[PDB]
Symmetry: C3
Subunit: 343 residues, 3 copies
């Protein structure tokens, strides 16, 4: 909610308390999942044409006791924007792939999980330099695109090191470039997006599966957003990029998400989503196994734009087996019951 607007700078301070509770046969995915977010979108007029902006967002768990209380920055970036030319923003942001793949990330809790956080240029991530251009230089009303770069983010110990290095390997990444082209018109929306990132010495030489020189992503996506209806699906194919449990990555992964939502006038918005992450010849005695697969059906009710509540039912179609145990991939169902104030 915009709490400052004066002399051309304006500041919107925003957040939510999500009273969330998971139900499951799985004890590790069962209990209070209450959390809270807090951020600000900032903005300043420099000229007619040029406008500068900042943006921050933190997440703080509220399911944890007075000792440990895990919490983290989600996005943090600053940048400029010139009329009919483009915009450029450096910091922790969304990777360019998300531009397309996010169109299926519309469920209230689950969904949009064929990618992880800090998973190369696939979703959230540190040190994205991002050019974007809306309406193609003000000529084609609808055609937006982006050209993104991500600096190497290696380890803390000597070999393959950066100042911000992380000792976790899945969070690591190398130098990558990615692109996106989206077009919207009368609700309908085509979307292509291609990334390609270098990999760290640690990533290949921890002895994990699905190793190579480069992690690469291809992404097609279609959506329809009109007349109370949101239909959208997407194809994302990856080489050595999709995470596979703790075992490593998938040499090749064929990922597909599809969602159908209708908004009733009184407040209810039921959904019926479906996900899939088929991992092709992974090697090391597994071969063509499914990394993820579930149907997801529930409904959000909207009291208004400040209060909401929802049920979300993950129907996990994965069978229990060695691949789904060695990797440690939850094969059980989960049901989330959310009740959320925001501002």
């Amino acid at each position: 909610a915009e709490i400052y607007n004066k002399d051309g700078n304006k500041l919107d301070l925003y957040g939510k308390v999500e009273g969330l509770h998971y139900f499951s046969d799985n004890d590790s995915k069962d209990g209070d999942k209450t959390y809270m977010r807090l951020g600000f979108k900032g903005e300043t007029q420099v000229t007619d044409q040029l406008t500068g902006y900042g943006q921050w967002e933190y997440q703080i768990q509220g399911n944890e006791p007075e000792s440990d209380n895990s919490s983290w920055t989600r996005v943090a970036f600053a940048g400029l924007k010139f009329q009919d030319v483009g915009s450029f923003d450096y910091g922790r942001n969304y990777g360019v792939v998300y531009d397309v793949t996010s169109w299926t990330d519309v469920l209230p809790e689950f969904g949009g999980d064929t990618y992880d956080s800090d998973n190369f240029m696939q979703q959230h991530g540190n040190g994205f330099a991002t050019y974007r251009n809306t309406d193609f230089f003000g000529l084609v009303d609808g055609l937006d695109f982006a050209v993104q770069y991500q600096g190497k983010n290696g380890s803390a110990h000597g070999e393959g090191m950066t100042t911000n290095g992380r000792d976790d390997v899945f969070e690591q990444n190398g130098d990558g470039v990615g692109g996106s082209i989206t077009y919207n018109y009368e609700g309908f929306g085509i979307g292509a997006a291609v990334s390609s990132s270098k990999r760290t010495w640690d990533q290949n030489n921890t002895g994990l599966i699905g190793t190579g020189d480069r992690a690469e992503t291809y992404t097609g996506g279609l959506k329809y957003d009109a007349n109370n209806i949101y239909l959208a699906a997407q194809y994302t194919q990856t080489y050595n990029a999709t995470r596979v449990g703790s075992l490593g990555w998938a040499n090749k992964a064929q990922n597909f998400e599809a969602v159908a939502q209708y908004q009733f006038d009184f407040g209810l918005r039921p959904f019926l989503a479906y996900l899939q992450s088929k991992g092709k010849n992974l090697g090391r005695g597994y071969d063509d196994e499914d990394i993820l697969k579930y149907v997801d059906v529930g409904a959000t009710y909207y009291f208004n734009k400040n209060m909401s509540t929802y049920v979300d039912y993950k129907i996990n179609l994965l069978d229990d087996n060695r691949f789904t145990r060695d990797a440690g991939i939850n094969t059980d169902d989960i049901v989330a019951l959310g009740l959320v104030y925001q501002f």
Copy 2:
């Protein structure tokens, strides 16, 4: 301080910097205790009758250096409220027992410590579902009550596990129900409150004292709040619920706190409190020993509703002995010097 109020949504963003310093013979309870809090109470009108709300509050220590900086969520919950029916809010909140026992938690720093944080349904805690009803459905102007449930909050390792599980044992809890009934009229206030919680496998089978199937609490409380005067005391009896050092819990504990405060017009508010936590036949070669006992006298001065400063003198009546050493219970005095801005 309410920084947003518009079209029925309103947001109050609040906090304080407490410049605090402990003096003591105990080196562990001596030094800078400076800390800071920040939260928001949120609120939105949905209808004439229905109003929805959120609330958050963090605490961040300011006595610590640039490396470690410990800090945590205190309360984080969302919920609805319907006129003359009640209110329901899920998240980290106060346990229902606090409804009564908080009437003695009126001292500036010490006091209100016959309960801990995440100590079952006794004070702060994760995953409270809480029904409340003010003025008994708008019929009896004075009679308020509550019906509270708390989900199991076990460990992180396999046996007795939840998604939010903590490896600390005192912070753990099981499924519990609790109630409260308070009545106020012309200042005077009766208050009863009863909780009863299941216990974790770890809690019984870490070999600590005062173990059982259930932790249970009984609480009576009386207060008088008028004519510059605040008199209030309370009785809280517990089975296997009160913490006793690091040794475990007290099979039975008889807890009593009493406070007397007077507010002078210029700003000074002296107090004279007294606490007691008599632990009855605890077992394991201790028997009837005192878990806590101190007289507490100081005074808060109020410059105004934004600035305040105070002295707080803990006169610890506990003697030094095996029970008060094995358990590791501070037998020494403490004096706090607070100087506090807030907003």
Copy 3:
């Protein structure tokens, strides 16, 4: 940006997103250095004369992934202020030495690093009680001064312990007193400042170099601030107070910083700084070596008071040798590219 001003209390909620990236031959000092700050300055009128205030400031790194996210309180203090008498504020604040030495801390990223954080009374630090007096009781328009005390801040383990104790040794400190006297007139500014702190048992008896009973600081400083020009330099001599790598402290250190900045009307503000930290007979087979030495030249461009961007070039004049390796002192160059929104 002041988001609350009402009935004499006013609250300014402020922060920035600094899109920062280090370039260097050093891998440890190379990568995304994106971070964010958030604080509030608070203030309340009590009387004509008396005014009470609070202040907080947190820093949260945005170069790190969803698991670890390091962040800390920078300053947190409350205090009162009476017209023509003085002001007194207890909490994590700046040490009194900074009063003078901060006049060289005017560069956009580097500079002001002959002192560390929690480095006795030299810069940031916990538990400063600070008296200050502006314009010498309203008599001499220009002469400001301060009298500061810092409580012992030892370790967490038994010997030399405080409630806030830190297991790091360089962050530790003992009881210290410090002073400052500054005088400004027509831009020109003389400044003297002297501190003297007790040391912890751990500090001497971890076997590190430059050990003694007391860490002491002497500080002279001169500045000129007018006609788009900022010229300022400073001398800081220390006994057993300046940190020297991981090896310990410098028995004696002769520190000097000098800066020259010009503000062009359109927005550019180039600078040309120079630093030096000559460590005299340190002992343990090193003798007179340089602890730090670099020339620093770049330029900040100011779009306006909300957006800015800059380049900052550390030209490290230190040679690579045993002292600069055993201590582990970066001998390499660094170049910072900042782009910063704030509010």
